[model samples]
Target: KLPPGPTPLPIIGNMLQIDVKDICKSFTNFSKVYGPVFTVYFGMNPIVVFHGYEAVKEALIDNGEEFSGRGNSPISQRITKGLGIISSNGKRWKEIRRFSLTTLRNFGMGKRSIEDRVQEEAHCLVEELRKTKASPCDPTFILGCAPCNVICSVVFQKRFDYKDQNFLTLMKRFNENFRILNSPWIQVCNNFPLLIDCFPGTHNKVLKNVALTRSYIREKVKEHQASLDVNNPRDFIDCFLIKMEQEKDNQKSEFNIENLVGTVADLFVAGTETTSTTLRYGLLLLLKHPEVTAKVQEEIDHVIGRHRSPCMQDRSHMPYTDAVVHEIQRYSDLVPTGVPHAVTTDTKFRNYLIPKGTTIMALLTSVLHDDKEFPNPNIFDPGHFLDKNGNFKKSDYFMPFSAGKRICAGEGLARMELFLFLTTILQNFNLKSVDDLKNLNTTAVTKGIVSLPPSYQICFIPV
Candidate 1:
């Protein structure tokens, strides 16, 4: 039997009790009454939720194989078309994931040398900021441009000028897709697929936007194919094209044009938004807590000084800055309830019989904010990631990138980008909130699949 949960209505399930907008809070509330492991229905599908760090760890890590399956939500299934790393399952997922990780590593992801690429982009970002002339501006698009270009360099072998019209459109479409993906209407459509066509909402817009993005990538792939040099692979696309050529005759090969398109789309969407959003939100946190900002700047001054660009090596010597970064991720609580995972087969977990294909949510918000892990978890105190002696600390429950076999493929790249991009900005300028410090609003402006900080302008005063 599944663990106890609130009784569900015929078609609506627990819609009245579960606040879809704030799924994290709703799940946390349910956990208190039903213990850690319990079932909740989204429309008619039974979703087994694992709350808290230990329970989540046991399922995602201990029994990883049984829980490694990706839940085919309506939006993801339709958008990915049942292909790519983010939505695919079984053999296809394994092949693409392996190839992607290896290809990325070869291109310097998760290594010290990748710092050079990020640093170059950081310089470009600084140049764009200089153009702002210290005026109050929304940092969302500018911040997003840097990370998007970094991923572009790896996949497309090129970076866009900040003012390029095509790049701007791509970013706009990407942002819109994320917004629609997290909208409540999409959640409803995920449970009741028929409504996607029947209802009048953002569902069609999401599909159209995704198709536009994919069309752009398809053009890039054609360009790569036209200029293919098997001996001299230029980037990710080139590497994948070469692989497709090598296995062209194989009847069961997953390396094809379809997977290629889907993989590139996945990388662009996943790589761009999350890291950029974190940087934007981290700045907001600094604005809200000036003292924390000051301490990080002091540490930056003591280590890298004002003249030199911050590097990955400096992170080791600068404990406070590192802790602040980690705390920003924790406090932001992006992806509160992580990407849904499904059971691969019928499995018994803690006296509950979870059948194959049951959707499971690892409540990342609960784990990141567990009182047992951090004292007063709600507060944005860097002390949670620091020791009494003022050294950086590590926690078992720190899971912003998630845990287990299905962890984020770009974890290392994201971390390097965050540390380098953030430190570089602080090294060059002091961010000041446009509003009075007391009036600054740090609450998230949007919460869906990811939590985004409220849109506010900030002046980057030259130091």
Candidate 2:
């Protein structure tokens, strides 16, 4: 038998009981009486919900392998057709994941070269901002500019100019899809995959965005193949093609053209979304908390100075600065529900039998907003991540990148971008909100799984 939960009714189950606007919070609310692990159904589908640091960590980490399935997303499944890393399962998922991990790693995802890429990319961002001459502009587009092209570099070995027509088209779709995904309708569609067609809305819009993206992906794939030199790999697209050549003899190889599109789309779609969203929230938070920005700028002066670009190594020496950066992410709380995960095998958890492929949502909000770990968890203070000695502190509650094996694949790379890119921005310019500081809001507009700050315009004043 399953762990007890709010009783489901007829075909609707507990769907009415949950708030579709903020399902993450809805699940957290459910955990109070039901305890940590409980079952809740949306229509006929039953999803086991895990809340709090202990409950989530226990399922995600203590019993990592069993809860490692990518789970099911109607949109993700429709797009990838069970091919990409996010939606793919079983042998296909395993092989593609391992290959992708190594390929990105080998090409310097976490190495000094990637740092160079971040440094250069971050520099170009400031140069572009400097052109604004401290104009009051919404930094969202510019914020997206850096991370998008950075992924462009990593995935394709090329970074696009911010003004490029093709790149602009891609960014528009990327942002548009992300915006649509933020809506409650997609969240509803995820619960009732069959009802997807019944609604005449963003489901089609998002699918269209994803579909058109394939044409671009196909263009890149052909470009890579036309100049394929398998003996020497140039980039991820190159390495992916190279792997396809090697996997030809293998009967069940996932390294083919179709899967190639899924993985590339995953990297570009998700890779840019996470980093840029966090970065945007970070800038808005800094704009609100000028005091925090002042302290970070002071630390930037003392440790990094103005001469060289801010590097990851500088993070340790600048404890206060690091704390602010960490707090920004923790407070921002991106990906609150996390990408859905499921049990890879029929398994037992918390004295209940969880059948294979059962959807499990380990609520990240439960950890990131744990009241005990982060005293006054809702505040924008950097002190949450700082110790009495003014040293940077770590929290088990600090799970923005998530935990366990299913943690974000670009965790290191994304963290670097947030740290290096943000610090770089502060060093070059002072963030001045166009509106009054008190009028600015940090309440993230929760959409589906992602949380983004309300839009605000600010001038990037020269230091």
Q: What is the TM-score of each candidate against the true structure?
A: 0.95, 0.95
Which runs in model 1 stand beyond 4 Å of their true positions?
A: 106-113
lDDT of candidate 2 over 1-463, digit per residue (tens): 7777899989888989998888977887788888999999988778898888998999989999998888767776677788788778888888888888787662433233667777889999999999999999988888888999887877675678889998999888988987777678876777777778786666678778888888888888898899878776666788888888887898777889888888888888778878898999999888888888998899999999998998999998988888887888888888888767888888899699998888888888888888888899999888998999999888888888778877777777788899999999999999887678988878998866778889888999998
Worst 10 residues of 2 by lDDT: 105-114
Query: In candidate 1, which residue pairs get closer than 3 Å at backbone N, Cα or C atoms, i.e. clash?
Result: none
- Global lDDT scores for all candidate models: 0.86, 0.84
For this target, which candidate reaches the highest lDDT against the unseen true structure?
1
In TM-score terms, candidate 1 sits at: 0.95
Q: Indicate which candidate wins on TM-score.
A: 1
| lDDT value, candidate 1, whole model | 0.86
With candidate 1 superimposed using the best TM-score fit, by how many Å does residue 208's alpha carbon deviate from the native?
Answer: 2.7
Model 1 per-residue lDDT tens digits across residues 213-327? 9999999999989998888777788889999999999979999999999998889888898999999998888877889988989988999998888888899998899999999
